[PDB]
Amino acid sequence: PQITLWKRPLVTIRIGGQLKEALLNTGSDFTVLEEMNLPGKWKPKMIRGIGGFIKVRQYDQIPVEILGHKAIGTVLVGPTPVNIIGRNLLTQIGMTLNFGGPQITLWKRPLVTIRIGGQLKEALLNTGSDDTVLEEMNLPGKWKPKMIGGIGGFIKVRQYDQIPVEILGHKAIGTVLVGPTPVNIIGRNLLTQIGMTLNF
């Protein structure tokens, strides 16, 4: 089955006898759930974090049913704003990126050369991102301030509209946010333009 990206790719998961809503997130190495009680040994871990590291609890070898597939893998629990199914569990259900609208497996970060300023960069393909967020660069044209959120809090960015970006040979044009990001992120706004789907 093919899952398009005009809307957030939310799915119902079953974990510890509980249903929850989670986002299928190719931009995440791991799976990060909002505060809940899970049965298991768990070890303190520190991840990611806009502004620094956030503390999470790391539960290993947990059953998680997703779209009717049973993964058994690592779940991190902590102060994420949304439940996040990362690649560690997307691989287990056999999810890939595709131009359903070349296949990009999810064993590694779906990194892809983009060309945007008439300039060329490496950028993550991120289904868990609404918008495209690019590392600090000069871009021509008018731009307005925006605050966007992720794990750890918010960062301030500049919002440029109607910006052309080439991605794996495809031409996309729309909104690009520019701000202090370790990694360029191609979000759904653009992913949809170029015809990308989550398939498993």
Binding site: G27, D29, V82, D131
Partner: peptide
């Protein structure tokens, strides 16, 4: 690395 931008 958990990237995600709402």
């Amino acid at each position: 690395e958990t990237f995600y931008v709402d």
